[PDB]
Write an enzyme that holds these catalytic residues in place. Sequence first.
Site, PDB file in Angstrom:
ATOM      1  N   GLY A   1      -1.438  -4.775   5.281  1.00 56.56           N
ATOM      2  CA  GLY A   1      -2.558  -4.386   6.117  1.00 56.56           C
ATOM      3  C   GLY A   1      -2.365  -2.993   6.676  1.00 56.56           C
ATOM      4  O   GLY A   1      -1.241  -2.494   6.778  1.00 56.56           O
ATOM      5  N   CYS A   2      -3.472  -2.363   7.058  1.00 54.64           N
ATOM      6  CA  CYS A   2      -3.394  -0.974   7.506  1.00 54.64           C
ATOM      7  C   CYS A   2      -2.666  -0.865   8.854  1.00 54.64           C
ATOM      8  O   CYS A   2      -1.771  -0.031   9.028  1.00 54.64           O
ATOM      9  CB  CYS A   2      -4.802  -0.375   7.576  1.00 54.64           C
ATOM     10  SG  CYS A   2      -6.015  -1.320   8.540  1.00 54.64           S
ATOM     11  N   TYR A   3      -3.025  -1.705   9.828  1.00 51.67           N
ATOM     12  CA  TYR A   3      -2.316  -1.638  11.111  1.00 51.67           C
ATOM     13  C   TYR A   3      -0.841  -1.965  10.972  1.00 51.67           C
ATOM     14  O   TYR A   3      -0.020  -1.242  11.568  1.00 51.67           O
ATOM     15  CB  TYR A   3      -2.966  -2.565  12.150  1.00 51.67           C
ATOM     16  CG  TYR A   3      -4.337  -2.173  12.658  1.00 51.67           C
ATOM     17  CD1 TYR A   3      -4.524  -1.052  13.474  1.00 51.67           C
ATOM     18  CD2 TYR A   3      -5.441  -2.960  12.363  1.00 51.67           C
ATOM     19  CE1 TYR A   3      -5.806  -0.723  13.967  1.00 51.67           C
ATOM     20  CE2 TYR A   3      -6.706  -2.641  12.844  1.00 51.67           C
ATOM     21  CZ  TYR A   3      -6.883  -1.527  13.642  1.00 51.67           C
ATOM     22  OH  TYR A   3      -8.138  -1.220  14.135  1.00 51.67           O
TER      23      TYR A   3
END
Lengths: 344, 344, 344, 344
Positions: free
Chosen positions: D149-151
């Site tokens: 995931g990006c976060y």
Amino acid sequence: ATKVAVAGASGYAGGEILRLLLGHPAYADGRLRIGALTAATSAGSTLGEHHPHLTPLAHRVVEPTEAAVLGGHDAVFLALPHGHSAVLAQQLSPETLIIDCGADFRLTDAAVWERFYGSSHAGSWPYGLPELPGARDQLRGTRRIAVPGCYPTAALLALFPALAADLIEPAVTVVAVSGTSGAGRAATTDLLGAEVIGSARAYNIAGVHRHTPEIAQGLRAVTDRDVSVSFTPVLIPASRGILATCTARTRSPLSQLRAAYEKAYHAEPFIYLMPEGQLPRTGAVIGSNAAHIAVAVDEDAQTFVAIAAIDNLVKGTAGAAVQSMNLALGWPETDGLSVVGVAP
Amino acid sequence: ATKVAVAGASGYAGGEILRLLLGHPAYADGRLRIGALTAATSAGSTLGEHHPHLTPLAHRVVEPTEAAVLGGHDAVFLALPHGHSAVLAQQLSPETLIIDCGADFRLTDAAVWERFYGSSHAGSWPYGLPELPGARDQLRGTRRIAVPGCYPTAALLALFPALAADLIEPAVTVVAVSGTSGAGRAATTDLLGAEVIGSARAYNIAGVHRHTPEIAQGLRAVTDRDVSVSFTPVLIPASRGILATCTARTRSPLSQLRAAYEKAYHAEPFIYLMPEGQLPRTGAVIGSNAAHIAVAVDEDAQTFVAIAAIDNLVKGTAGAAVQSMNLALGWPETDGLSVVGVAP
Amino acid sequence: ATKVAVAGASGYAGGEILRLLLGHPAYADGRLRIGALTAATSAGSTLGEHHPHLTPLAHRVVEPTEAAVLGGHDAVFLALPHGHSAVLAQQLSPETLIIDCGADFRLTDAAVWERFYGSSHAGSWPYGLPELPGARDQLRGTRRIAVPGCYPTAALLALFPALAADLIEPAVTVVAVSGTSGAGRAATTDLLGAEVIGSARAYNIAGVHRHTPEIAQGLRAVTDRDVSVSFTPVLIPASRGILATCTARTRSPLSQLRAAYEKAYHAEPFIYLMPEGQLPRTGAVIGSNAAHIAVAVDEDAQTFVAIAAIDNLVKGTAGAAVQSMNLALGWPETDGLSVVGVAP
Amino acid sequence: ATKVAVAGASGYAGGEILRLLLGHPAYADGRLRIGALTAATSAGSTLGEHHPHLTPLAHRVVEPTEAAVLGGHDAVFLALPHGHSAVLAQQLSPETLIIDCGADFRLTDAAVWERFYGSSHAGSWPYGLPELPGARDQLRGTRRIAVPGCYPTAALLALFPALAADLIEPAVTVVAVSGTSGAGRAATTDLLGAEVIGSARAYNIAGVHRHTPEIAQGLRAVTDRDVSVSFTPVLIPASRGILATCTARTRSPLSQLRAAYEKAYHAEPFIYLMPEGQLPRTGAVIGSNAAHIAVAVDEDAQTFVAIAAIDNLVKGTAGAAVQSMNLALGWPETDGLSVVGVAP
């Protein structure tokens, strides 16, 4: 007291009408009451789930948009700028004050309506642009108001004083940038934040945009000549605001053009003619009902240039609606409507 | 009648004070009058050249920021959030109501002041955050107001009720995003539109930001425990707004924490506790003097989370100044200050 | 091998030239080497303090902009779009390939130069817009390049094919929106993020913008008729991008106008003619050296409409410089220059 | 050659994968071919109607997302960051290289998966974050990649070196701002430009965001202690970028923490540790596969502070996918992936 309903309350125009009513002096002293708030979907939800900025009304329950719900009010705002409200309006009394933010009653030529909207013409109501010549007279005590489109408001305020004084040619070019709230609250890929942020695009170009004949109609009303309108709208990464750049060939000196605008607007509370050397910016009018206007002459190109900045949701929509409401009810035209923008 | 001057009128805070004064009911009825508008540069220019949104005052000539120009005013706003106004305040007549937007009179510990600001502590004036425990009583009839910093306003509103009830540990973490007007109108490369648009950056991290001790001071006022503050500000591509995310370790039930927020803010008109399932957004409070607050508990992380949204130029600066001015002058605290944001 | 210097490396154009050089295939294979990076201020700072995106060069020390520092380089970019580089270019060794991003060598009429710039005309160098008729042949093997202005690039690409075919009248109107990096990295109040975000404004209107005569010059090169240009630039809240809306009176069939665009651009890799029913957007070309163009006819207004989108820092400045550099050095024209934008 | 398919080609992650493949050196020399481009809806449309920036592929016809269409390719990107691709992946050969941008194969605890996603756990694949300790080993020659995931990418790069060296406490706080493309291209009122522009809001707070256990899982892999994660995401008016502010209590001196980050990242091509005094900005990494990281110690608060900036669509999604693809196929890890951002 005057009981007001807002149909289309969960959209952007409906939310902005309600913001203005909450600040209106007739609301403060009890002469205006906010009644039914209606929507086509989401009836049963609360207004706070749609407009978290309107906290005094957050607990109001949205009702279904039906003639029965809207009946029993003294004034009804049809806050559907992109909708078609003729069917609903035909169910309401001629003595109910109806203020339609949509286009159904703006145009005075049935053939033009049929070509651009593809349906039977419903008729025409007084055009809610009080600053146009003769318009204030038609609005006083009316029970029917067709609120102008946002782009025509900016273009007509930029151009009509020059054309009415016969100081420019009747072929005009308008290129107007607009923030995205003018496209409405309906969810669309092309209106997504990731798409709009960092990008600009012209759309509905070369005369297909339905505001083109609306601009032409307003300009034809101030001249005897055939009017042509080249209108290009451009979407930009702002939530609000319209900056219209309007041009036309001229043989007139700047001194004469400037005098025409000073004469037209010197006593107009919402129209601010910029001091020489200054130019409009949409940031300076956001939240206000003001239009900021500047004019100039491009000597080499024999071209008149007029710039107009408005808030598309206020003077371009909900502020025009409230301003016209005041005129219809005999209240001070400026009631509830500031000229001071929320900047920066 | 109260004649008001604004020193530093050409900056963002000064422009926002003037917007609020123009909409204030005491201005409309003649009790509040707008006098000298001053700046350190550009004396002799007109206000419209600096603040085109303030068209009612466009023709006012900016005067030099000097005690002689500021004399004859019952109230003087020192609208210099990033300035040091102790020297100028000493030059005014002592009976003037002096309202300082800067930091010189905010802190109550001289050693803390000298460590963060590098100068001798001047003292402290009543802190212009009326919702803090004990604050409102110090503002009634005061002739001196120290307006809070914008970040401490959001952080203190988010955290003080939980700490006052002893329901969270006194080691707090704050990460606050801010629009760029909070950095002031002084031109710097780092604040240019091309740089800020499309970008986010933390700055002055790990305790060097001067609002860190201001947050600690406000929290130490509600507890006997040793308070520590980790504060990170983040600039984002918006003109206005602060969203503060505030955390602390807790083992208290969420219902008890909510009860502390209800006890603090149930009768506070500018503080809105969100309905269950709603969270604050800075777009809902822009232009208003409101703070929207939500609280929650992360049970897995044993962490309290409080979110606060304000307009950095209103409740975080100019609205705090005007709210405190109302208290100083004995006027209704809410006069001139709306709870409704300008959205979208 | 070509050792390249960039004067004015700390500005936006200089940073974008460096980004393109770092991605250029001749840099990767050793034929292109990046030498001195200079600025008028901040000598002794590192490049990473100015351009954190250029991490491969972060440790480079900025040197003063002086002929002595620029010696020993086969090519020198004078990356000062708003500067006047005739004096510095005179100080370099005449065999250097000199690529000027500013205006001093763009115009071919001395009286026009003196009227718009207030100084003696220096002359002209090959114009770095290879797609204009006759331009590419003047750039092959040149040692001098005058990079076009960003607005003329978009306007000329939009209009020249129709005018060259004599299918539109020679009185053209251009309204172009631009992101703020085109105004340069010099800090001014009017370019601050808080001011630009959420706002749009026209500036330098009615023929005072110095790109007006540059557009006229490029158009006069493709027709024998008398050309006039009404040019309005509009700043919008984006960091990059120009969307030019260009109009002129026409009675020619749309198919003939499209044929002129096909003849001009069918073999041009950086010019994309949109598929029928699609319109350009500045977000689709950001980071690329492409221009996306669409044309149409407003039959009611008898008006031709051309829309052109470019990245103002690539095809409007640094990409034009590098494209022209490739031609000057005998390298494939497309080297280092992508047609793919970075979207969303 | 390696024939590559992209399922979910019309979304943001799919468009960004294709942008990177178009610039990949294996695409240029014919070793990589772009095959089927598929979507769940709009099959029969052309790619240009979804991604106008990808003009080299504008004529490709979108095909239906079906195992049969995706079979016959050597590598398949499942470009559905918010989708659930386990059912499709189970239909593809173990020898097909599958790179899943979604979450279905990220987590290694079935009970944690069931709690946060409400479905049966599909299993786990090598995690496409090559810089994490041990991850590069697992990716080399794999036929299965779960892209992070990006976060979590930003938070893990900020925190893992400190935690792996046992220099901070295992209770961490992350507040991360993100542009709106991370929410995907599905049209939603809350993602409309008018809503997002000019506003910031935290969402999915207090441990309900599904990236919370993903961050915890990555951190638990580098320590022996119980890890807790307070994770707050904040949406801001940008199209791209994540700026993560990460904090944890510490007893370690800054010199020791800095040395740990220098040791972890000195030979990592995509991770840039900022020089002392500089801080990350998302604008500097847009379009690049880089992460910019800074660390500091807040002595008074006994707190370690780490800031990480990435492009959510590149190092946070499609760039991670291509980087891991290179490792899986034995190609240079940096192929097709720049460290230079597109700024401003």
